[PDB]
């Protein structure tokens, strides 16, 4: 039943303006992310995240999710996954030098 079409972190194909408008919300907590379809990439996805600093405000970091033509995914040349979900779990409990461990998803 768990289909990537209705994932808790899968909105689908959205514009870039609305994307930054969803993570750049004073109500969104620092750590909110969202996986959508590759708008500028090809046959790939894009995991975005939200961050907050005590100097300027909250910014939005975009982490394009790569995809191995063999059948895998990875946003860095060191860890690989067999499903966009696995990549969201590892980065959800281990920033691994990311902007912030995933804590919430986009509503």
């Amino acid at each position: 039943m768990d289909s990537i079409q209705a994932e808790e972190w899968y909105f689908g194909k959205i514009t870039r303006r609305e994307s930054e408008r969803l993570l750049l919300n004073a109500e969104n907590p620092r750590g909110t992310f969202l996986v959508r379809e590759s708008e500028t990439t090809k046959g790939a996805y894009c995991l975005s995240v939200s961050d907050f600093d005590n100097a300027k405000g909250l910014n939005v970091k975009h982490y394009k999710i790569r995809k191995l033509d063999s059948g895998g995914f990875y946003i860095t040349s060191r860890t690989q996954f067999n499903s966009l979900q696995q990549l969201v779990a590892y980065y959800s409990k281990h920033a691994d030098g990311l902007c912030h461990r995933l804590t919430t998803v986009c509503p």
Partner: peptide, 5 residues
């Protein structure tokens, strides 16, 4: 985009 380092 950013890079994991």
């Amino acid at each position: 985009y950013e890079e994991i380092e």
